[PDB]
Amino acid sequence: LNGLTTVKVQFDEGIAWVSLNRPDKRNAMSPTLNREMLQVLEALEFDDRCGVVVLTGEGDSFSAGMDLKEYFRETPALIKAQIRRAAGAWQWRKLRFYAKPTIAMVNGWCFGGAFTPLIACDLAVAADEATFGLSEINWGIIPAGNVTKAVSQVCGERAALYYIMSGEPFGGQKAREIGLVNESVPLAALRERTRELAKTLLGKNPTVLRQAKHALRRVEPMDWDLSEEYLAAKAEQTAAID
Amino acid sequence: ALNGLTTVKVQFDEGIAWVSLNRPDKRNAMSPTLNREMLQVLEALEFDDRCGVVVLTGEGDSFSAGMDLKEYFRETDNAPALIKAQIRRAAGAWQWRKLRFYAKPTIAMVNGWCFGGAFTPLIACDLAVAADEATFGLSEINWGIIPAGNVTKAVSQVCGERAALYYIMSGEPFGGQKAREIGLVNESVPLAALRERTRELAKTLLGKNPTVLRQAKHALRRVEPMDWDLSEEYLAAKAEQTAAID
Amino acid sequence: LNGLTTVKVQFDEGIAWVSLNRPDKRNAMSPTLNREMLQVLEALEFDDRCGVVVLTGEGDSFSAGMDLKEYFREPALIKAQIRRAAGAWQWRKLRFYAKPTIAMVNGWCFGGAFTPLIACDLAVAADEATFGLSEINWGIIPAGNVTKAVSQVCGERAALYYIMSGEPFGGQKAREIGLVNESVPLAALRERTRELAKTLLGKNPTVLRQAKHALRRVEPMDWDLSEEYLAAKAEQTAAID
Amino acid sequence: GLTTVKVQFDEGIAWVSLNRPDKRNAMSPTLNREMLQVLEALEFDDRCGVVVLTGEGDSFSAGMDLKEYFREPALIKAQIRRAAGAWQWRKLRFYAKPTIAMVNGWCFGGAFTPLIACDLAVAADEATFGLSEINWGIIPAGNVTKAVSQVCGERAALYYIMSGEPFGGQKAREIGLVNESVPLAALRERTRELAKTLLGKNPTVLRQAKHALRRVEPMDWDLSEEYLAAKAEQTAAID
Amino acid sequence: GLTTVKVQFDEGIAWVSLNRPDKRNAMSPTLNREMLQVLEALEFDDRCGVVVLTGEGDSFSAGMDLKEYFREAPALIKAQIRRAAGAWQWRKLRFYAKPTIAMVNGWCFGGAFTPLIACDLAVAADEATFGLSEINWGIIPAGNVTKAVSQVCGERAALYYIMSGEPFGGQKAREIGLVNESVPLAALRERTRELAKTLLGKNPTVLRQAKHALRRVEPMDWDLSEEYLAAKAEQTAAI
Amino acid sequence: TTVKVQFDEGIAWVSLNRPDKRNAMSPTLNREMLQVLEALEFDDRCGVVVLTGEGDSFSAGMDLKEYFRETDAPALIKAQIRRAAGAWQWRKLRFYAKPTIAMVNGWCFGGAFTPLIACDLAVAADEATFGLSEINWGIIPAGNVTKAVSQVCGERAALYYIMSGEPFGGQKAREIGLVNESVPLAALRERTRELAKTLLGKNPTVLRQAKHALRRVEPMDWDLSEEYLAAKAEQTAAI
Numbered sequence A: 001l002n003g004l005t006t007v008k009v010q011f012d013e014g015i016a017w018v019s020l021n022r023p024d025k026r027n028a029m030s031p032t033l034n035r036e037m038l039q040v041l042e043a044l045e046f047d048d049r050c051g052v053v054v055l056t057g058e059g060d061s062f063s064a065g066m067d068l069k070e071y072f073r074e075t076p077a078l079i080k081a082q083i084r085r086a087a088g089a090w091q092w093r094k095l096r097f098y099a100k101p102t103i104a105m106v107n108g109w110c111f112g113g114a115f116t117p118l119i120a121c122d123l124a125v126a127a128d129e130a131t132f133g134l135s136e137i138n139w140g141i142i143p144a145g146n147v148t149k150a151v152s153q154v155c156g157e158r159a160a161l162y163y164i165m166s167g168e169p170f171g172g173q174k175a176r177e178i179g180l181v182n183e184s185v186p187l188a189a190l191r192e193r194t195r196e197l198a199k200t201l202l203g204k205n206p207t208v209l210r211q212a213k214h215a216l217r218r219v220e221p222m223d224w225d226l227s228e229e230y231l232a233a234k235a236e237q238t239a240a241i242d
Numbered sequence B: 001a002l003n004g005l006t007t008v009k010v011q012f013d014e015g016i017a018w019v020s021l022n023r024p025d026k027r028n029a030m031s032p033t034l035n036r037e038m039l040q041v042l043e044a045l046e047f048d049d050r051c052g053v054v055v056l057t058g059e060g061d062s063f064s065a066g067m068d069l070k071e072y073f074r075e076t077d078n079a080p081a082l083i084k085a086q087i088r089r090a091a092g093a094w095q096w097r098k099l100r101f102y103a104k105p106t107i108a109m110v111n112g113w114c115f116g117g118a119f120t121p122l123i124a125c126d127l128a129v130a131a132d133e134a135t136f137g138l139s140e141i142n143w144g145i146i147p148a149g150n151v152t153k154a155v156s157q158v159c160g161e162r163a164a165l166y167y168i169m170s171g172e173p174f175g176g177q178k179a180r181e182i183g184l185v186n187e188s189v190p191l192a193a194l195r196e197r198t199r200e201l202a203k204t205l206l207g208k209n210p211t212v213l214r215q216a217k218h219a220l221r222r223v224e225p226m227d228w229d230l231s232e233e234y235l236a237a238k239a240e241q242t243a244a245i246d
Numbered sequence C: 001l002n003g004l005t006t007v008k009v010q011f012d013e014g015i016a017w018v019s020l021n022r023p024d025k026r027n028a029m030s031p032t033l034n035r036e037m038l039q040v041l042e043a044l045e046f047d048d049r050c051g052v053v054v055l056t057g058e059g060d061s062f063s064a065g066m067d068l069k070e071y072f073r074e075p076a077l078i079k080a081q082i083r084r085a086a087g088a089w090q091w092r093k094l095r096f097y098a099k100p101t102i103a104m105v106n107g108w109c110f111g112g113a114f115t116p117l118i119a120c121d122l123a124v125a126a127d128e129a130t131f132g133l134s135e136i137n138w139g140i141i142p143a144g145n146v147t148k149a150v151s152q153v154c155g156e157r158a159a160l161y162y163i164m165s166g167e168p169f170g171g172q173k174a175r176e177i178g179l180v181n182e183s184v185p186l187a188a189l190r191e192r193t194r195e196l197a198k199t200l201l202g203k204n205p206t207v208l209r210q211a212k213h214a215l216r217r218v219e220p221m222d223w224d225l226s227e228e229y230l231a232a233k234a235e236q237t238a239a240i241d
Numbered sequence D: 001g002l003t004t005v006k007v008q009f010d011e012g013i014a015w016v017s018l019n020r021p022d023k024r025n026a027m028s029p030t031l032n033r034e035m036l037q038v039l040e041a042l043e044f045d046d047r048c049g050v051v052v053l054t055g056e057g058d059s060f061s062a063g064m065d066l067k068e069y070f071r072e073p074a075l076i077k078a079q080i081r082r083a084a085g086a087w088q089w090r091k092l093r094f095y096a097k098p099t100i101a102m103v104n105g106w107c108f109g110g111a112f113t114p115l116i117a118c119d120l121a122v123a124a125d126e127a128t129f130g131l132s133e134i135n136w137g138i139i140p141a142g143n144v145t146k147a148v149s150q151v152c153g154e155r156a157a158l159y160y161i162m163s164g165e166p167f168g169g170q171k172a173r174e175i176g177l178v179n180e181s182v183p184l185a186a187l188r189e190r191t192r193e194l195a196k197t198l199l200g201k202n203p204t205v206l207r208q209a210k211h212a213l214r215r216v217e218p219m220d221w222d223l224s225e226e227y228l229a230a231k232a233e234q235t236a237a238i239d
Numbered sequence E: 001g002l003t004t005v006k007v008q009f010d011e012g013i014a015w016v017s018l019n020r021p022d023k024r025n026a027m028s029p030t031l032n033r034e035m036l037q038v039l040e041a042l043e044f045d046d047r048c049g050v051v052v053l054t055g056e057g058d059s060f061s062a063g064m065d066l067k068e069y070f071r072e073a074p075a076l077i078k079a080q081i082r083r084a085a086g087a088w089q090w091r092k093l094r095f096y097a098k099p100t101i102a103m104v105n106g107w108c109f110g111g112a113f114t115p116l117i118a119c120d121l122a123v124a125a126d127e128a129t130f131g132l133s134e135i136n137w138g139i140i141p142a143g144n145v146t147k148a149v150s151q152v153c154g155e156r157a158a159l160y161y162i163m164s165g166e167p168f169g170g171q172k173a174r175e176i177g178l179v180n181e182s183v184p185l186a187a188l189r190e191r192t193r194e195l196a197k198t199l200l201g202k203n204p205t206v207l208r209q210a211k212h213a214l215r216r217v218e219p220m221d222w223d224l225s226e227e228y229l230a231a232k233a234e235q236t237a238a239i
Numbered sequence F: 001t002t003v004k005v006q007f008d009e010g011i012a013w014v015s016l017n018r019p020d021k022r023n024a025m026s027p028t029l030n031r032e033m034l035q036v037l038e039a040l041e042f043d044d045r046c047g048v049v050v051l052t053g054e055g056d057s058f059s060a061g062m063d064l065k066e067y068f069r070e071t072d073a074p075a076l077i078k079a080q081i082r083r084a085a086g087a088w089q090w091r092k093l094r095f096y097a098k099p100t101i102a103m104v105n106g107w108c109f110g111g112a113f114t115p116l117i118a119c120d121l122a123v124a125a126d127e128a129t130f131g132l133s134e135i136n137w138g139i140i141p142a143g144n145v146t147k148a149v150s151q152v153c154g155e156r157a158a159l160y161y162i163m164s165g166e167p168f169g170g171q172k173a174r175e176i177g178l179v180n181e182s183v184p185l186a187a188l189r190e191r192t193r194e195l196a197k198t199l200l201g202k203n204p205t206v207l208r209q210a211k212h213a214l215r216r217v218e219p220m221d222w223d224l225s226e227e228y229l230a231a232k233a234e235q236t237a238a239i
């Protein structure tokens, strides 16, 4: 957490408000931001100053997507693949099964690549004024990285295809309708609502909370006979490590 | 199989088998005894000509308060491992193994409290009509346990990842209208109209061809993990099997 | 495209209005229509006069499902070939069509019509449209690929309710359960559908085709595999553009 | 109380023998019900820590009963079909104790499912295997088609399903149907030595390990690592 | 009227011969279209109840035509050409209405692995030379060759020959489960004809249902496969 | 320090360097081996990596003292140490940017199976001893060992050696598909070098794309694999 340039961490009574911090660039996710975000999230897993992580963006943006210059334009094949993997290293590899509960607080512009860490977070609270967009089609690219998969994970096929194919923007209430976020409230109540939800998660047994939210995503592709076998081993693991 | 029941009641009604958990003093908590009796009841009703549809509900003010904290959890905590496994299997033996592909159509009538383990038989049933006043809750997190058995899988089967994680992680209660919005139940109506609405839907299912109704509702849950090429092959055999056994 | 007997095709500023043309039979899908529809869909994938295809029904019916007279009632391998020819255009060709597809449900949509409706990329229904999985009322299961198609876009509760009950529902209910993207009054159906088609026509056609395919491809994949596939898909997109 | 099954206890080994030699150990609804009772009773019988499945006489099992199971209502037929698979693979494939199939002779049709659902299998060289269902005008129903595909390659599975051609114990070993094939005179002792080897292991760890192998097969590597981490913790918490 | 494929009928056996010996039976877009028409014509031709796929001359097939298929286009046209190959190589062949046997009489390289593996069975000559030689030409085993080899061979053997491009004979192909049997070339035709006659003696409806069910149940869990096999058995008895 | 790296005309001989501990994989070695693999995938002096062990061992498995006993630690720390093992043993190795060959020169037990199987190819010495000895130590084959064995071995062979913990040599490892080839130890180094030189003669881009494509298409249906392989082939030509 020392010498961060693109990421801000503010601790608040057990809550780690992690803000993408490139407001002048609308929090576009560059290779520098990708490296810092993984370093922050890895450190916060063992930082006792927090038991829940809130992911948001500084200024009027959640995130305008990947940096069109520093991530896309300025990027050898193996060198290119390493930078692409560094994005997914924190956007979904670390976030999807994160050690502590995660809440995405969408305060504003959320486009393209921003959908992957938003969906990899366990919960999401958006502002009514927040503007979501799968604008990749308008920039001549598909929703790569894991954006296409992430949208398919939480939204129905009809809604996923409509916003990928058309690139049409939509607000927080529409994001809640299609299952992209858990709740949409006015921006003036966004932080208060997200903080109340984080405080509710802080009141739970942290081990049981971690085991339960992981098991939900693990059992998704399993058959019912396999899920019962996994959940039984997961329940015994929970009581053994608490 | 229907005689000497201590925790479950069965009442026949014009081709409907109203199966209600019968431990109201315990809010219909599901004990190992109840898990054993319900499997007996559901197995017998699959061949009982007095029914063409099964309605699963609870006596009193509770649909179910989840697994018995005393008889299912506490009294089996220090039991031998294979004994605990057998008790756990017996719960899922009727909660999802029997219910999810029951030979007859099943409707879950959520008349009241529905917590924790009660979500698995509720979701394993084909259709679900809840009361607006009913209170749902994945309160396992507040008791220090994960939603085990098959509760976690059952919730992810009908509810989106956001709604599934929200109520699993927060343990927050919600009513029948929220259960309908998140896809947990088909319909939500006031409690005063819950039985008449459930009975009307049950009579609608009774008016259908029972063989085709059984075959079609099973095929829906079978084809979900299949690719479209495999599902077309399975639906072709399922359609031929339907015509041969009708 | 020449000599068609059950399908009509009208070109409109890059839009291929493909209508099932059996209105006196409520656009029931016969083995003849199944053969012609695949014949038309294969030709339109390379027809430079179209960049988007709108599937709709002539008259008051989008489609009344499979032809109860020419398809169902009328050898095992012969029966299998006729059944396969239905899915050949209803999902095999439509689900990963080389061009964007929009289903315009102008009226009756029952049984087997669900498969090409769901295999299309997008769907705009009329509020007055009447959907229904009435196969249970006819004594059959939603065969072909209907059960899978309904499973693909609707939640398990909604899918089971309409399959088991055979209850009909309107355009707004179809939009609510995720069967279609939007639902407008019939008087505004063609204008809204043409507006959506022009929006798709303004996109990069190669990127649009690759993106709509990638969405349906990554669904059964794990996140590690989908990231690998999307990286290869993104590279294929830039190379063939 | 059993009429179709014989159980012999030997130093922690429960020798479970199919006992219908007059019908070549064909599996009837009576045998299917009796076998589930035996397996359910043996999983808590402390007198055994390993179960060996074999057949009395010159047969392992000639498949399902052509008369009782097949020739003799829709949901009644489905119940009898489910009773066969209830013990043939639902109970056996994840049985609480290690299981060994000892193929002493004829092994045809439906016999493949309990043979494959068992953890391990030792065959006699003189034993004759055969997916002869095609010769009787039926497909390998129940779960035989799935069971054969689980242990043998697609080529070997298709060859013996489509041709109905018999093969011996050495061929069964080569295609992976059984772990080992020895002469019949050495079959029981080789099986008993393997059963004794399994009895020397930690029973909890052995049950957990053998279950974990079959569970992780359809998992991706990221998910299997998560499953194996919980399975190992579950192992240490109950041992 | 066919130019690249030859069809000879023999007592219910349709000997289908790839016929481009001057190009070592390389598969061109012309051959790909002709093979699909032959397969679509033979599935209802009562002169055959079994299909034997092989190659004329000293070749089975040297893979895809390096000139006509790869070297000699717009994106959708190249995809249509690519789709036409898989249309007969695996889409039609993998679930073909009639039993299929691949007779590997000679060279079998690259893209030839897909129709070889999509056929139900395969008998090779010991002298036949196999090879996933795409790596030697600077391309991955595209089409469905990578999946086909993954379907019948273990991961070690699949990776070894994909990565090394090293050739191997008929006995090695039998060892790794690529073919069911390998015999001397002088005995290949009679050994293949005997297997074809063995398939012709089966109930053709039951044979088609069983060979399809084997490949359908591969990715199913055991509970789902039992559900599918019960429906497949009822469909078999009805048709 | 715990790893040795020797460059040889494009070959990166990567040796586990804890011979006094039989190359037991400590948390120290786990972190160091990941850095070596990360450094080599961008080191232009190598186009192939051979993973072997110093001394008489390939690897005796995980360090019983430093990896297991000394982590007896809070749950998240234990999970972090466990994840660091799989970070290089399969997360980095299974889809490594360059071809990998495991040279099993000696003892290969327990956790050593995971990096052995995550390597693309493997050549063993006949004299080398292989063992899934976890059952003898009271633990299940955790990490990804159970999944790795199931990935390359049949269910029977996987279950036999997990349940019995029985040791086996290089020829048996080749017979069950654990390694590609087994030769006498005196010929092991040159046989592995021939394979490494063969891999070095291939287009490294096409070789990486092809070897990755094989493992990616395993769980796909044939229609999905064809779509993936077409994009993979286009990605190959563009890169």
Ligand SMILES: CC(C)(COP(=O)(O)OP(=O)(O)OC[C@H]1O[C@@H](n2cnc3c(N)ncnc32)[C@H](O)[C@@H]1OP(=O)(O)O)[C@@H](O)C(=O)NCCC(=O)NCCS
Residues within 6 Å of the ligand: A024, A025, A026, A028, A064, A065, A066, A067, A068, A069, A109, A111, A112, A113, A135, A136, A139, A141
């Ligand atoms: C997010 C957005 C609506 C904000 O609107 P705005 O308040 O008017 O701010 P601006 O459009 O003027 O851009 C703000 C700055 O941040 C940069 N910026 C915005 N989004 C960026 C992105 N993905 N990548 C890199 N830079 C970005 C701009 O280049 C600009 O830089 P500059 O001030 O040095 O010239 C608008 O910037 C936008 O549409 N960005 C692209 C969103 C997107 O489509 N992402 C997916 C790309 S595939």
Ligand SMILES: CC(C)(COP(=O)(O)OP(=O)(O)OC[C@H]1O[C@@H](n2cnc3c(N)ncnc32)[C@H](O)[C@@H]1OP(=O)(O)O)[C@@H](O)C(=O)NCCC(=O)NCCS
Residues within 6 Å of the ligand: B025, B026, B027, B029, B030, B062, B065, B066, B067, B068, B069, B070, B113, B115, B116, B117, B139, B140, B143, B145
């Ligand atoms: C369902 C509930 C809201 C009803 O509240 P109520 O009407 O006021 O009734 P009570 O709380 O007084 O409980 C009545 C009886 O039923 C028992 N009971 C209720 N739920 C029970 C359960 N899962 N298991 C065992 N007993 C239960 C009570 O212990 C009590 O028994 P007692 O009278 O002998 O003391 C309440 O019982 C409850 O909060 N929780 C259990 C629900 C739950 O969270 N289950 C999952 C736990 S993992």
Ligand SMILES: CC(C)(COP(=O)(O)OP(=O)(O)OC[C@H]1O[C@@H](n2cnc3c(N)ncnc32)[C@H](O)[C@@H]1OP(=O)(O)O)[C@@H](O)C(=O)NCCC(=O)NCCS
Residues within 6 Å of the ligand: C024, C025, C026, C028, C029, C064, C065, C066, C067, C068, C069, C108, C110, C111, C112, C134, C135, C138
């Ligand atoms: C679609 C429907 C609501 C239209 O009702 P309508 O305007 O009153 O039209 P009609 O019912 O009078 O029938 C119109 C004609 O189209 C035919 N038709 C309608 N649906 C048909 C279908 N699936 N298959 C074959 N013919 C059909 C009728 O047989 C009739 O032919 P005819 O006039 O030459 O005798 C009506 O046909 C219906 O109730 N059901 C359609 C069938 C259906 O549900 N199919 C899925 C079944 S598996």
Ligand SMILES: CC(C)(COP(=O)(O)OP(=O)(O)OC[C@H]1O[C@@H](n2cnc3c(N)ncnc32)[C@H](O)[C@@H]1OP(=O)(O)O)[C@@H](O)C(=O)NCCC(=O)NCCS
Residues within 6 Å of the ligand: D022, D023, D024, D026, D062, D063, D064, D065, D066, D067, D106, D108, D109, D110, D132, D133, D136, D138
């Ligand atoms: C196993 C077999 C090779 C033994 O040959 P054998 O020593 O000559 O024994 P036989 O066939 O002469 O007779 C054995 C008795 O057991 C019965 N039997 C053998 N297999 C049987 C089976 N699946 N089901 C019912 N009865 C069977 C015979 O009907 C016969 O009864 P009977 O003596 O009262 O007339 C031979 O019996 C056989 O082929 N059985 C069928 C194997 C098979 O195909 N199973 C799959 C069926 S789909």
Ligand SMILES: CC(C)(COP(=O)(O)OP(=O)(O)OC[C@H]1O[C@@H](n2cnc3c(N)ncnc32)[C@H](O)[C@@H]1OP(=O)(O)O)[C@@H](O)C(=O)NCCC(=O)NCCS
Residues within 6 Å of the ligand: E022, E023, E024, E026, E027, E062, E063, E064, E065, E066, E067, E107, E109, E110, E111, E133, E134, E137, E139
């Ligand atoms: C099959 C093979 C071993 C036989 O070699 P041979 O008997 O000595 O005879 P040739 O090598 O001269 O080949 C004979 C003709 O068929 C052609 N031929 C062989 N394989 C061909 C292929 N895939 N595509 C197109 N033409 C091919 C040759 O170009 C040659 O053409 P020509 O006679 O007009 O000059 C050799 O031709 C060969 O290696 N072919 C390539 C196999 C392969 O790698 N396929 C995968 C390609 S990615």
Ligand SMILES: CC(C)(COP(=O)(O)OP(=O)(O)OC[C@H]1O[C@@H](n2cnc3c(N)ncnc32)[C@H](O)[C@@H]1OP(=O)(O)O)[C@@H](O)C(=O)NCCC(=O)NCCS
Residues within 6 Å of the ligand: F020, F021, F022, F024, F060, F061, F062, F063, F064, F065, F107, F109, F110, F111, F133, F134, F137
């Ligand atoms: C590999 C093996 C057969 C070699 O036998 P050996 O040549 O006679 O060598 P030794 O047993 O005498 O031990 C050599 C050293 O290496 C260590 N060693 C060997 N395997 C080790 C392992 N997994 N972990 C930690 N140390 C190990 C010994 O503790 C010993 O250290 P020390 O000399 O400081 O006391 C033997 O070490 C063995 O049987 N098992 C090691 C672990 C194993 O087999 N499986 C993993 C258990 S889960």
